[PDB]
Design a protein around this nucleic acid. Structure first.
Length: 78
DNA sequence: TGTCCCCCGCGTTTTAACCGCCAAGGGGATTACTCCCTAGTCTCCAGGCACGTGTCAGATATATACATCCTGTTCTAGAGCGGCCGCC
């Protein structure tokens, strides 16, 4: 219990910076013109943009417990 | 018959094997829509098969000729023997 608590504290303490970095992810216009940005996780909805990272990773953990996340993709999302 | 070096029986310490357990994700297995070319004819015709035959390379023949193997004679190296020489 305390180990999972410390892991969630490590998630939440940097969450206010990670969410700000993701929400202000300035994509390169030249990479968008040439189709160079990574859209591997954006097709299945694994992107963290436009939402809080902690609630999204709680939902991701719930579905990974449910066994329909194809776990290595969840590793890539993390 | 010998021998010695190559393999076997066993002590010891690593070393990976098998079961215990967990997901994954290509991949075997199944079902269905569709589509080409293979089953089956019609006709024929040009390549394939039966027959006849001039022929051109293989075999028989034999003196000549290879061709290597077996054997006889000689060359040269090695061990044994005897004569000569120096020392006690």
């Amino acid at each position: 219990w305390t180990t999972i608590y410390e892991r969630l504290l490590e998630i939440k303490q940097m969450n206010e910076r990670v969410t700000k970095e993701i929400n202000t992810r300035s994509t390169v216009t030249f990479a968008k013109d040439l189709d160079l940005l990574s859209s591997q996780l954006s097709e299945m909805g694994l992107d963290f943009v436009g939402e809080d990272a902690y609630k999204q990773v709680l939902r991701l953990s719930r579905r990974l417990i449910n066994g329909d996340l194809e776990h290595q993709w969840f590793e890539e999302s993390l």
